[PDB]
Amino acid sequence: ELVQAVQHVVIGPSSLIVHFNEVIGRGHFGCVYHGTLLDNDGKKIHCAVKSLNRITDIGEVSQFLTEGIIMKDFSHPNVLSLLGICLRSPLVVLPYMKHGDLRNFIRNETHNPTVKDLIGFGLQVAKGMKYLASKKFVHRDLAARNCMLDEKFTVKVADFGLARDMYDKEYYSVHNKTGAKLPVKWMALESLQTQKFTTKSDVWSFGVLLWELMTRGAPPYPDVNTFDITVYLLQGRRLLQPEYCPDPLYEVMLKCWHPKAEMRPSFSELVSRISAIFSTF
Ligand SMILES: CNC(=O)c1ccc(-c2ccc(=O)n(CCc3ccc4ncc(-c5cnn(C)c5)cc4c3)n2)cc1C(F)(F)F
């Protein structure tokens, strides 16, 4: 179908087995399954298989693929990579992340991340976001639920390109003219008003992500309904400082939430400030 530059990452159906009995994720476009993939060197690796079987339209799947295929060119330790796609239900094959999504890991009681672990997680997210911003890539849905944690405690910024989906319906509003799915309590103030997204709106969401990490997965603005959120933000009210968040780190989040998008720090400035907080104390 049309251009075949996707043939560079096509995986043969005989090189992949999808364990349909083991669901590790559920998006709106399809579920995520455990998978077994044979490398080009003949090695068996764990992998996750995201299906897009809920979007059934020759034109709409083609636009999603060509819009998402850019992730094959991205390569950064804190950015989720594309192992390939299996054309058979256009399957997206992704590396398996042992600890799942970042928010579920830190919410789990039986896990004992330290205050320094949580700060380091946010520094990894900042490093991955700095890379994507360098490639002029806007990640309109940055949140703790949308980052992954692999075997070596390496955080991967996910939910973009062919991996983009709504994996937690609770926090999204579906605009009823455009198709846009809006994470209301993670969007910048100007995004709530105009529904356009920039790298500076990503910085706002990163501050909410940082706040999520320091509360170990608490939902932001639990007493502010999704209508009153825009006025709440217009009065200058912001998410309060978590109990175990260092003062210099809370000041970083406050910088991310400035009414003016040009006032907020770049992700490169965020990496510097967080790494300084990470090396001290
Ligand atoms: C209970 N988990 C979930 O509901 C759940 C599951 C997945 C996501 C989520 C976020 C971004 C993203 O790109 N992908 C799909 C791609 C992807 C790739 C490798 C994965 N490797 C392991 C697991 C996984 C899930 N469990 N384990 C023990 C491991 C999920 C993966 C998901 N998925 C988000 C959530 C959610 F946020 F909503 F919490």
Residue 170 identity: E
Instruction: Find, among 24, 116, 3, the residue nearest to 69 by Cα.
Output: 3
CA dist 239 and 254 (Å) reads: 9
Structure tokens of 230? Answer: 């825009």
Architecture of domain 97-281 in this structure: Orthogonal Bundle (1.10)
Does residue 179 contact residue 206 with C-beta atoms inside 8 Å?
no
Q: Is 26 annotated as a binding residue?
A: yes
Method used to determine the 3D structure? X-ray
Sign of the Cα pseudo-torsion (210, 216, 217, 222, in order): negative
- The string of DSSP codes covering 57-126 is -HHHHHHHHHHHGGGGS---TTB----EEE----EEEEE--TT-BHHHHHH-TT----HHHHHHHHHHHH
- Note whether 89 and 55 are within 8 A (CB): no
In Å, how far are 121, 125, 256 from 267, measured between CA atoms?
15, 10, 10
Element (H, E) at 45: strand 44-50
Q: How far is the CA of 191 from the centre of ligand 1 (A)?
A: 26
> Separation of 238 CA from ligand 1 center, angstroms?
29
Tokens 């490093």 belong to 127
Nearest to 139 by CA among 199, 185, 71: 199
Question: What letter would DSSP give residue 9?
Answer: S
Q: What is the DSSP string of 177-230?
A: SS--EEEGGGS-HHHHHH----HHHHHHHHHHHHHHHHTTSPPSSTTS-TTTHH
Give the residue, out of 79, 94, 148, with the most ligand 1 atoms within 8 A of its beta carbon, to mutate for a pocket test. Answer: 148
Do residues 85 and 91 make contact, with C-beta atoms less than 8 angstroms apart?
Answer: yes
Domain boundaries along the sequence of the chain:
8-96, 97-281
Q: Tokens for 195?
A: 């529904």
Dihedral over Cα of 224, 199, 102, 19: its sign: positive
Q: State the burial class of residue 272 (Cβ atoms within 10 Å of its Cβ: 0-12, 13-18, 19+).
A: middle
Q: How far is the CA of 101 from the centre of ligand 1 (A)?
A: 5
Given the structure tokens 């995986």, which residue do they identify? 11
Q: In b/e form, how buried is each residue of 85-109, taking b as 16+ CB within 10 angstroms? A: bbeeebbbbbbbbebbbbbebbbee
Angstrom resolution of this structure: 2.3
User: Could you give the CA distance from residue 52 to residue 31 in angstroms, rounded to a whole number?
Assistant: 8
- Return the residue whose CA atom lies nearest to atom 1 of ligand 1: 25
Tokens of 92: 């997206």
Confirm whether 141 is a catalytic residue: yes
Phi and psi at residue 112, to the nearest 5°: -125, 65
In a mutational test of the pocket of ligand 1, which residue from 23, 146, 167, 168 has the highest number of ligand atoms less than 8 Å from its CB? 167
Measuring CA to CA, which residue among 269, 117, 276, 279 is closest to residue 207?
Answer: 269
